[PDB]
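Hey, I was hoping to borrow your eyes for a little while. I'm sending you its amino acid sequence along with the C-alpha cells. Take your time with it, there's no hurry, and the full record follows here.
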Amino acid sequence: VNPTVFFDIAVDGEPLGRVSFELFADKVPKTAENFRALSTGEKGFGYKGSCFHRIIPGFMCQGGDFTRHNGTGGKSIYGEKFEDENFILKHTGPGILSMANAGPNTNGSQFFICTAKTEWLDGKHVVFGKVKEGMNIVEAMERFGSRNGKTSKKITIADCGQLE
C-alpha cells in the first residue's frame, strides 16, 4: 500500500543507476505525499533535473533544492513550509529518508538519505521513507562527496517518478 518512488541518478550527465524508496504513508501520510508528488511532478514542479548539493561520506546525501540548487531553496506542495508531522520513526541506520529543515515546522522539499545511523537527529527531523532498492547506488554517490559536503561532480536526478 505504501508508494514506491524512484530516482534515476546521473553523474555529470552520465547514468549511474536507480534508487527506489518506500514512503511510509501509513505513518506520515502528509510528508510521504509531499515527496511522492514532487517525484512525479504531477503538480507542475518537483525533483526532476535537480541536484544533490551536499554529500558528506559516512553521514548523508542531501538534495531536493529544485529552486536554488544550493540548499537555500525548495518548496512543498502545501506552500513554502509545512509542519513537523510526527517523530514516530527514528534514524536507525543507512538508507533512512528524512526531511531537512531550518527549525521547528519548516519542512519544504529538501531531504537527506542517511548513510550512517544518525540518532542525534531523532525528534528533530521527520523520518518518512527508506531505500528499498539501490543502496549500492547511494553508496556510489557517496564517493563524489567530501568532508565539507561539496561534490566533485554534478549529481543529478535525471528522471524520477512512481513505481507502485
Notes: The radius of gyration is 14 Å.
